[model samples]
Target: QQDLRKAFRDAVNEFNPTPMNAWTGTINDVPIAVRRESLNVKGVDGATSVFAEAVVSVSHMSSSRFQVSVNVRTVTPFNRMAPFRTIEKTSYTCSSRDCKSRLNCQCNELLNSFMNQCVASGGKFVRTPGMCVLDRTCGTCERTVYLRQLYLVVREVSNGKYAEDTNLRSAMYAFGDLDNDYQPGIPSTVTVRLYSSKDPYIALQRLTKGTNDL
Candidate 1:
């Protein structure tokens, strides 16, 4: 958990304003806060958007060849209205923003969610494979069911992947076609594939840094 601790420190130090104000005399421009309260999925004003994301360095294989998993916890509350749900797993390459969490894997549903959310938020979803997009459902969906964390488990690291000699591991959500909706009438098993790359990291970093459009 050392890497998690460090990333948490990074989140708090670089994102949270109230705490940063006291320590550094000025808070970062965005309204980044700790996910300490129960997730209020319906509480508008970005309540469900409340989550902490961190990437931990794990498994080392000769430095350049290494493995890591991105883990995030939904710092919100859950109940009946905010029913906990699990989405189908997807894979991504390291080419888009969400790959930071999905270990660079992509899926059609995930991409659809990303596209839908951006449009719903009065934002634009660029027509390209590797462009970064926001999860419009992030405000409502991820908060109630901890969708991000769930997806991280099912999609990003189920059977898991290894980088050279570095073994990758992840644990969070259960795997299955948790949702009962599918065009093929809900198959007994779900298999998926997608792509991601490293270029999106810098742009997404700019987003967290508040130097670029979200």
Candidate 2:
């Protein structure tokens, strides 16, 4: 996914990012707060927690060859999760009396001992890293992921005033993996807020002059 993003970004950079050629938006804080959520994370609820901000670059060519323009705007990330069906219930079990010498009590003691060992080792089950972000609280893993840009190429074909489809435009972008809720393909589409207009080619050219300027 990282490589995919990099390649897309390189392509966008090759073209140039300007207000005329790019669209951008800030990501929501909800995903960061939910630690499990990420740029590629997904939940049962369709959401955008990964994108703190997004920028999209676009290029346009009229099919009729009459006019040319470009549109740029901020983007947002979004996600959806698969539904799982399971029963929720509570139950209690008691061990047989003559089966053991207070096994439950001994089990409790052993558990406490193991817990103490973990604490001594800094709350790690096997004492590997400083602390287990996923095990400790899951939430600790939540943070603002710095993604400078997520670039995409969009194809726009305006209907030449004589067809059922007035205008046809196709955009290719990506979100988290759908296979694993937290991975980059989940839901498959990113959160986006389009900022576009029919700007003259000269305006677009001005915006594409450099990266730092836009």
Give me the candidate number with maximum lDDT: 1
Candidate 1 wrongly placed segments (more than 4 Å): 1-106, 129-214
lDDT (Cα, tens digit) per residue for candidate 2, span 109-172? 3334454544443433332234222222111111111111221223223321111111212111
Candidate 1 structure lDDT? 0.26
Q: What is the TM-score of each candidate against the true structure?
A: 0.16, 0.17
Candidate 1's displacement at residue 50, Å, is 24
lDDT of 1 by residue, 115-161 (tens): 56545544444534444334322221121111221111211221223
RMSD of each: 21.9, 19.5
lDDT of each: 0.26, 0.24
- The TM-score between candidate 1 and the true structure equals 0.16
Q: Which stretches of candidate 2 lie over 4 Å from their true place?
A: 1-13, 19-153, 156-214
In model 1, state the lDDT of residue 110: 66
Could you tell me which 10 consecutive residues in candidate 1 have the lowest summed lDDT? 164-173
